[PDB]
Each structure stands twice: as C-alpha cells, then as structure tokens.
Design a protein around this ligand. Structure first.
Ligand SMILES: [Mg+2]
Ligand SMILES: [Mg+2]
Ligand SMILES: [Mg+2]
Ligand SMILES: [Mg+2]
Ligand SMILES: [Mg+2]
Ligand SMILES: [Mg+2]
Ligand SMILES: [Mg+2]
Ligand SMILES: [Mg+2]
Ligand SMILES: [Mg+2]
Lengths: 150, 117, 51
RNA sequence: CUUGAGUCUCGUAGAGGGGGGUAGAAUUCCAGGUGUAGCGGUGAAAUGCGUAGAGAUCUGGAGGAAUACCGGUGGCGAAGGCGGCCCCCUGGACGAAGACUGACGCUCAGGUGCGAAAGCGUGGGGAGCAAACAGGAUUAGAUACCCUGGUAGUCCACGCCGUAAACGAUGUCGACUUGGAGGUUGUGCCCUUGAGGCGUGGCUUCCGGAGCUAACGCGUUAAGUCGACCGCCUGGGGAGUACGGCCGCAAGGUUAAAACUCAAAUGAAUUGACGGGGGCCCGCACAAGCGGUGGAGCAUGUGGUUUAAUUCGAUGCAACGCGA
C-alpha cells in the first residue's frame, strides 16, 4: 500500500554469476533447500547447454525469449463488473514470469527426475514447443481479445 | 465489376452496434460490413475496436470495385463513431469529406421513456 | 457540420461536432424526456452557476 | 380641493388571449433502386424483425405531432398557464410630457366566471409515446423495475368534471424602516468623439443589517413597524370518513359528525450511529506471490445420536488441540 519496497537484491549466480539465473534457482528451490536446487538447475542447465552447444546462459536466454509475454490482463472491478483489461508487462516481470512458468510446467512433465524434465522443457521453450510457451500464447491471446478495453 | 473509384462511406454508430456501408455517390450500396457481425457479440460488439475490424472488413469487399477516394458520412453517438473512419482511411483510402448526418429534430416526436433503475 | 479541408492531411477536425450537434443534444434526446424536470433540475444549474 | 382612483395624447416591451394560414428538422408507414446475412436489444439475454431479402443506403409519396438553435440568474398573465414564422380580432402593464374628472376608493360572506393533468359524452384524427393487455427476461416468487409489442389516451371541435405538494405550503389594498451586487424594460441630462458618465420610474434574482422567529430562517418583493376588510386553526387516531343536503353522465366533488380509542401526535435544532451518500486515508484487507485447508487415513475438540451415566462450562468474528 502506502509502502514502497522494491526489488530485494539477490545474490549472484555461484557457478556463473548472473542475477537472473540466481532467482531462477530460487523459483525452483523448495523448502529452503537452496543446495538441492542448484544441484538440479546446473545438471539440467548442462545437459541442455551441451546439445545447444552454446554457453548455458545463451541456450537459457533463447529458451526464455519464447516464453516471454509482453502484455497480460489485469483484473479490474470498476462498475459492478470485473472487466479484464490487458497491459504491457514491465521488463523485470517478463523474465520472472517466464522462469516461473518454465519450472511450474517442467515440474509436472511426468519424466523421471526433475533435472531431466527441466532440461527438456527448457529446450522445447526455445522453439515454442513445450508448455511454457503455451502459457504465453493463452495469456497473450487473453489480451487483444480484450483489446477493446485496452 | 464497375470500378467506381470514388463513393461515400455511411457509418451507423448506434449505441449498441456499428455498421459501415460503402456506396457510390448515388446511394447504390456497393458493399457493407457490421461490428456485431464481425465476431464478438453483446458487450464487446459495442466497443470502439469492434467498429474498426468492421470498417476494414467492409473495404475487403468494396475495394474490389476499384474504389480509390471516398467521402465519409457519420451519424449517431457510441464508439466506432470516429474509429471506423481511421481504419477506413488507414486501409488505403483517399479521404475527402467527413460530415455528421446525425439526425437532430427541432423538437418533434416524443422520445421513449425506458431506462429506469 | 461539414469538413472537406482541401490538401491531404490525416487530421479529423472532429472538434466541430463537439461544438454543436452530436452528444449534449443527441445524448439529451436519447432516452425519455423531461416535461417539468428541466424548469427545475436544469434551472438548478444557476443555483450553482452563481459561483 | 387634488395627493387617492380614473380619463385623454404619444410611445415601449411582451411564449397574454381567440381565429386562420405556413416553413423546416425528425420519426413512422407505403412503393421502387443498390446491396447481403444479419439487425434489434441487455448486465447478460431472450421475445422480436431478417433469404418471402431485413438492417444499412438512395429516390418518390402519405400523415400526425412537436417546434433544436435563440433561451436566460429572462418575459407576459388573476390564477391555471403561455415558446417556429405570418396575418386578422383582442386584453393587460409601464414611462413620458403634459391635459381632464374631482374621493368616483380599499376589502367582500353569498353570488358569477376562469380552473394543470387524468377522467366522461358526441363526432373526428392517430406519427411518436404509452395505463390495460401479451410475450421475453430477472427472481425463492416478480401480478414490478428491464426488453419486444401495444389499446385507451395523449391531438381536434363542442359540452361536462372542478380537483393537484393549484406551493412562495406566505390573502388583498395602503404607509413607513440602514445596505450591497445583478437581470429586465421605459425615461430626463451631459464633447456619447466610442461605447459611455449624472441620474430617474415599472417588473425581477441573489446576499444581508435592525428587528422579527421555537429554531430553520425572513429581511424595503419581510416572516420588520402599522392600518382596512376577508378566509381559516383549537390534541393524535377514527376521518375529510359515515349520514343528510346540493352538484355530477359517471368517476366522484362539496358541505361535514359521532361512538370508540391513545397520552401522545407534531415543528425545528442537537449529538451520535447508520447509508447498497460523497471526499481523504490505514491494516497480509485486497491486489502480487509462496505454501496450506476443503478429498484421503489417523489425532483431537464440538454438535448430534446413543447411554444407567456418556459430569459441568465455552457456541458469529471474540466457542470447537477452549477451561484441562
Ligand atoms: Mg413498456
Ligand atoms: Mg385533458
Ligand atoms: Mg374523449
Ligand atoms: Mg410578473
Ligand atoms: Mg436574506
Ligand atoms: Mg425531525
Ligand atoms: Mg504486516
Ligand atoms: Mg490474495
Ligand atoms: Mg493454491
């Protein structure tokens, strides 16, 4: 409300040193088990970076580039009616949502081990193939379909 | 077909719907399009965007008539009252005149009561 | 309310309608009427117009 | 006798009244052209209108009703009320110079006349709107609000009905009592060089002093200070009802009680509370997120049921791993 927090500075990626990558590990992290998280992020970040051949953060970026929404609808209760109005998503949010979607979808990929799942979803994303990108499509389709209010 | 190259564009910006009709300077309608008919219904059909998709949708019909330039006849409030025009021109149309043929009686018939909540 | 404006230039000059017909009058006659409501509700605009 | 009242002359403004014309904008309806799958409507919808071609669009025609803009803190009228323009018949008001009659005045029970809308009778008219009525929707229901239709009526002539929060909720006529700002209409005077400035009558807004007032407020257009005449009130309910009279085509109007019953009914102002009133703010209140409950097995408390007893207490949030 009146408050004005902001962006809680996150500790840079250890094996690398990228703030973005760092928060990506937290999103996947669970029960405050930060170690277990990294043990999964890298293992899958490697099995993929290998195939792509290019540096992790590149294949990583590309993957996100697809699962990157530009606009989304924001609920608004104005006039005894909840009108769904779309709006361009800020830069920071874009990366966040993407990462969140990637994991949330990767976690439920029915594979064998989280690592493998993550690796796959991360790939499929880099070419609108997995569920991550799917979300963005449904979200982006939400907008425009409400562009009237936009 | 006839190649008119220049006619008029009537716009019915009704409070609920928005239809755009293109016809030669005679009156003979060459082709028409409507908001409600262009997809979205009820609530969304009576929005500014609605009329837009309609206007362009109309041109995709009368443009085959070799229409180049054309005037603009508008009447009625509601959205798409102005919108329709833009999409009409932007769609590649040499616009010229724009007049509001909105009917305004110097006190004649008694309007309906209605709306009471 | 006519608008020909020679010479090409994507400017509507719509402001014209907004200085006569269109709403205000159209929106006025839209629904029901008044019959007595004006001599009061409308003549109450002065009780405010005073200041 | 002339200052009250009236008369005459000359102007001034006006939606004042009666009658008759007439113009333009729009709606609807009819006919034809172009054109094609929707239109219309709502919160959504649906009824409805559409391929028998609607809607939109253009042309031609018919008809009724009402007169955007001007237009207003505006004007006229006794009140009701009266708005396009033109003609004819007509009423009132105001000023100005003056001229004339010479108290001819003010008020008025009864009486007479005028009276919004709705309503009634006869004969017309009927576009739009709309009691009734019929569908559709909404809801627990919805004999409503909303939607689609739609008769009376709304319009006209003549007659009847006489009521309204017919209100300024404030009777008419007259004389006095500090001010300010403004509208409207007439008029005398001044280089009006230009509008303008000095004023002086009529009508009319807003603020406000004294004083008046229970207060709110009124305040030279008084609800102030006085005079002439009139109408009316005497607790709430019952009841503007019954009965009777008069009036009315009727609907009903007008005149107007009692029995019984209550200790109040009521006006204004005050504080607070509340409002599906307004403004401005706070809180994991929401929104943004993470993880849960509600399903599962079990633990536990409660209600319930049972029991000879299932000891008593806690029960919206603020009771239910609570007193234990
Ligand atoms: Mg109705
Ligand atoms: Mg009548
Ligand atoms: Mg009759
Ligand atoms: Mg007067
Ligand atoms: Mg005062
Ligand atoms: Mg009270
Ligand atoms: Mg906190
Ligand atoms: Mg939340
Ligand atoms: Mg959840």
């Amino acid at each position: 409300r009146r408050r004005v927090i902001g962006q809680r500075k996150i500790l840079p990626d250890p094996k690398f040193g990228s703030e973005l990558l760092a928060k990506f590990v937290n999103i996947l992290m669970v029960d405050g088990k930060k170690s277990t998280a990294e043990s999964i992020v890298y293992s899958a970040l490697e099995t993929l970076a290998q195939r792509s051949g290019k540096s992790e953060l590149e294949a990583f970026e590309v993957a996100l580039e697809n699962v990157r929404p530009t606009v989304e609808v924001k609920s608004r209760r104005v006039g005894g009616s909840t009108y769904q109005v779309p709006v361009e998503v800020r830069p920071v949010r874009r990366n966040a949502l993407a990462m969140r979607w990637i994991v949330e979808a990767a976690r439920k990929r029915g594979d064998k081990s989280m690592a493998l799942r993550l690796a796959n979803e991360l790939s499929d994303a880099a070419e609108n193939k997995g569920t991550a990108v799917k979300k963005r499509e449904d979200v982006h389709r939400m907008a425009e379909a409400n562009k009237a209010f936009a | 077909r006839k190649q008119v190259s220049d006619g008029v564009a009537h716009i019915h910006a009704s409070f609920n719907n928005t239809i755009v009709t293109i016809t030669d300077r005679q009156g003979n309608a060459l082709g028409w399009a409507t908001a409600g008919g262009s997809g979205f219904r009820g609530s969304r059909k009576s929005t500014p965007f609605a009329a837009q998709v309609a206007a362009e949708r109309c041109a995709d019909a009368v443009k085959e008539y070799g229409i180049k330039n054309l005037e603009v006849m508008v009447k009625g409030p509601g959205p798409g009252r102005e919108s329709t025009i833009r999409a009409l021109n932007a769609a590649g149309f040499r616009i010229t005149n724009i007049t509001d043929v909105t009917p305004i009686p110097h006190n004649g018939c008694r309007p309906p009561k209605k709306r009471r909540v | 309310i006519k608008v020909r404006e020679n010479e090409p230039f994507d400017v509507a000059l719509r402001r014209f309608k907004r200085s006569c017909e269109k709403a205000g009058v159209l929106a006025e006659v839209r629904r029901r009427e008044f019959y007595e409501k004006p001599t009061t509700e409308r003549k109450r605009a002065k009780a405010s117009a005073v200041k």
